[PDB]
């Protein structure tokens, strides 16, 4: 159901090594709003050797409405395919709204580590991301 308070969904990015810009999952509905996983390579000019995986949760970004807001908790996880006990996750808490409709980690993990076959996150050039999102009832959506 769309109005559920929480959900866990995964997003697998294929040909991960070739990613150059943000890739987005299809929407997953929680608390009557659409949520997406956004993944992108990131780097900063002062640390050109430290390219990272950027990993964000995005809420209701297809809307340009300035009225909506939704506070959510989430666990942002990259799945270790070799050992499910070696997956890596980091927690967030954020009021989502138009000006800040995503939240997560620009420097989630080093790109060189996620793409290292020996580390267990990448297989057949595929990396799987997962979000467990626990959202509050939104405001500014229903009349």
């Amino acid at each position: 159901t769309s109005w559920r308070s929480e959900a866990t969904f995964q997003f697998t990015v294929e040909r991960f090594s070739r990613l150059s810009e943000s890739v987005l999952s299809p929407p997953c509905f929680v608390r009557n709003l659409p949520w997406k996983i956004m993944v992108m390579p990131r780097f900063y000019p002062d640390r050109p050797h430290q390219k990272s995986v950027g990993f964000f949760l995005q809420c209701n970004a297809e809307s340009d409405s300035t009225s909506w807001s939704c506070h959510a908790q989430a666990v942002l996880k990259i799945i270790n395919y070799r050992d499910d006990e070696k997956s890596f996750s980091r927690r967030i808490s954020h009021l989502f709204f138009h000006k800040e409709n995503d939240w997560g980690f620009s420097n989630f993990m080093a790109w060189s580590e996620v793409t290292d076959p020996e580390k267990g996150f990448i297989d057949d050039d595929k990396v799987t991301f997962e979000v467990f999102v626990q959202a509050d009832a939104p405001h500014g959506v229903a009349w």
């Binding site: 943000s22 956004m38 992108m40 908790q73 927690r91 939240w103 997560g104 980690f105 620009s106």
Partner: peptide, 15 residues
């Protein structure tokens, strides 16, 4: 084991 506090290093994407 989950130890790192919520939001450590968190931000918007800037997109």
């Amino acid at each position: 084991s989950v130890w790192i506090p919520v939001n450590e290093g968190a931000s918007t994407s800037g997109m």
